[model samples]
Target: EHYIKHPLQNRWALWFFKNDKSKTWQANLRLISKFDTVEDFWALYNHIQLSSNLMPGCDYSLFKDGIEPMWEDEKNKRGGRWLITLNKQQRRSDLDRFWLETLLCLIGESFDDYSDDVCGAVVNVRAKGDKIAIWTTECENRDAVTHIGRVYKERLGLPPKIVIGYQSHADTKNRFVV
Candidate 1:
């Protein structure tokens, strides 16, 4: 057999956000790295600080190459995210685990046929609570949206009683849930 690295289908870019009041929103963002192999991903993941350890206002975003992790991007304008908000208590015990699972879901192509619908994922570390969201490229595609939600929940090992909602980039409200 030959030696080879496990390659991911998509080239992903990792972005880090550190909140600074004096800077513009865009100015606060930094591209940490980009990787296309599973080996490279692990190296990058291990080198960065864990999500739970970030300052309250910080965030980590992993989006497909060329797709900025924001609603303003053309690929994300019609999209929505399936959000999981964790309480402060869970930050110490569960935040990093959940965030890691989310990344694996994205890079491992865990959504089956709907994998293409996934745009990226983001984890926001906030004083109020920590939030993780998996963004899908189409908010109005009911079948695709719901399917991604179902698979995402299962992959995250969320219990049946726990619920995650889908919020569209076009809306200011939280409506859909699975």
Candidate 2:
């Protein structure tokens, strides 16, 4: 009764956070819903406030069910994120398209053999710029991580001149720029 009938390979949880200066970070983030089917995904996506309109400090995160959207999550502890930082110049224009594509990639399982390596993605709406990070399962698996990054960047239709960075969760000093 807990699971929904669907064709997607994995279930995903949607989390929403609206910054409140008076509350702790953990308290602001709230799990909104879970969906396993294409239908449910659209239903939820359409009903929510698009990322573009979210004020600074707000975020939308989509992670595979059971994987909390945190660096300390079991699967994320040893993992890293392929970060895509967007210029503030296109803030409102590309916000929806970029995030929607990222979401589709998550539910679409478009990573081939590396699909399981993906943990989730988080979009942070900021005043300076915006960021969409795809969290993968392992940072040491360079082959898997690189492949996911390459494919994801391509799916986002980013220009060749635009370089992205992948940083491991454990690495505090630098990142693996691809």
Candidate 3:
């Protein structure tokens, strides 16, 4: 039973960032771990703090091994994110669950064909509220974007009335709701 490990379709890197003015943006961010197998991922995840338990201004990012969490990365330059904003109340209720489901969806390749379009995911713990976003490679492909949004919402089991929006990395303000 211990001989073989279940491999993931892609290797992923997990990053952690803390808000610290004393350091540069990139300097404050660091790669925590990388895993290519399901068991390895579980080990990494289990060893980390749960999203809701993190201090405000902390962020957790999971991306394809070679891709950085920043929007400036080549793979993420033309990409956008499916964002789920959580209120203070939901932080105590839904934050951790939704974030876990998001991680599973990525590592599991739950989007199937559209999975390649996925760049990674981010969970930001902020003072005002918390936010979770799944980044995709191209925002121009509405078909792929909407498909990912639909499946992501379904996988997260978000209510029909709760809408999530997609916004490009280059500029914010425009929205494509799912």
Candidate 4:
């Protein structure tokens, strides 16, 4: 094999899940691929439909190569997420911006030393509303949690008044809105 590919900073895996009335939720999920190059990343990105086009009950998750995109994973058991809940019209207007911005902040390692705190990002296409979330592996690490949130907010160009909620997997029902 020629293997002529431009190397990327780190490897990432993409997961795709389609809703099924007959299959169990877990059974509906699939590990799409893992890529360690920019070319393959773009190829994979471009091949997929935009998140806005996803059917309700579907989800697209992009996570670090070794980490699974679920709260139950050992890598995620101690984690939290800074979730951006999108309203009706926002689904279309900010879909590209928020999703792409999240990817850039993640893949570009914009959080400096806190980059490792990020496990991945997920886009949920639901009838209720679309939501985007960045999972943090160190939910209790205030430094990383705070810094990652700041970097994510800035990189995504979120409105100043917009607040991102950091909810931990350890906590249920009520959670941190900071």
Choose the strongest candidate by lDDT: 3
CA lDDT of each candidate? Answer: 0.92, 0.90, 0.94, 0.85
Task: Candidate 4: give its CA RMSD in angstroms.
Answer: 2.4
State each model's C-alpha RMSD to the native: 1.0, 2.9, 1.0, 2.4
Model 1 regions lying over 4 Å from their true place: none
Ranking by lDDT: 3, 1, 2, 4
In model 4, residue pairs whose N, Cα or C atoms come closer than 3 Å (at least 3 residues apart or on different chains), thus clashing, are none
Question: What TM-score does prediction 1 earn?
Answer: 0.97
Off by over 4 Å in 4: 1-4, 172-178
In terms of lDDT, model 1 sits at: 0.92
Cα displacement (angstroms), candidate 4, residue 115, comes to 0.6
TM-score of every prediction relative to native: 0.97, 0.93, 0.97, 0.92
lDDT of 4 by residue, 1-178 (tens): 5778877678999999999989987788799998888788889989988999988888999999989888888889999898888887888899767998888777788889888788999999887889999998977788888888877887778777877888897882424554
lDDT of 1 by residue, 39-108 (tens): 9999999999999889999999999999999898999999999999999999998899999999999999
Query: How many backbone clashes can be found in candidate 4?
Result: 0
What lDDT tens digits, residue by residue, belong to model 3 across residues 1-178? 7799999999999999999999999999999999999999999989999999999999999999999999989999998999999999999999999999999999999997999999999999987999999999999999889999999999988889888899999995756898
User: Which is better, 1 or 2, measured by TM-score?
Assistant: 1
Total clashing pairs for each candidate: 0, 0, 0, 0
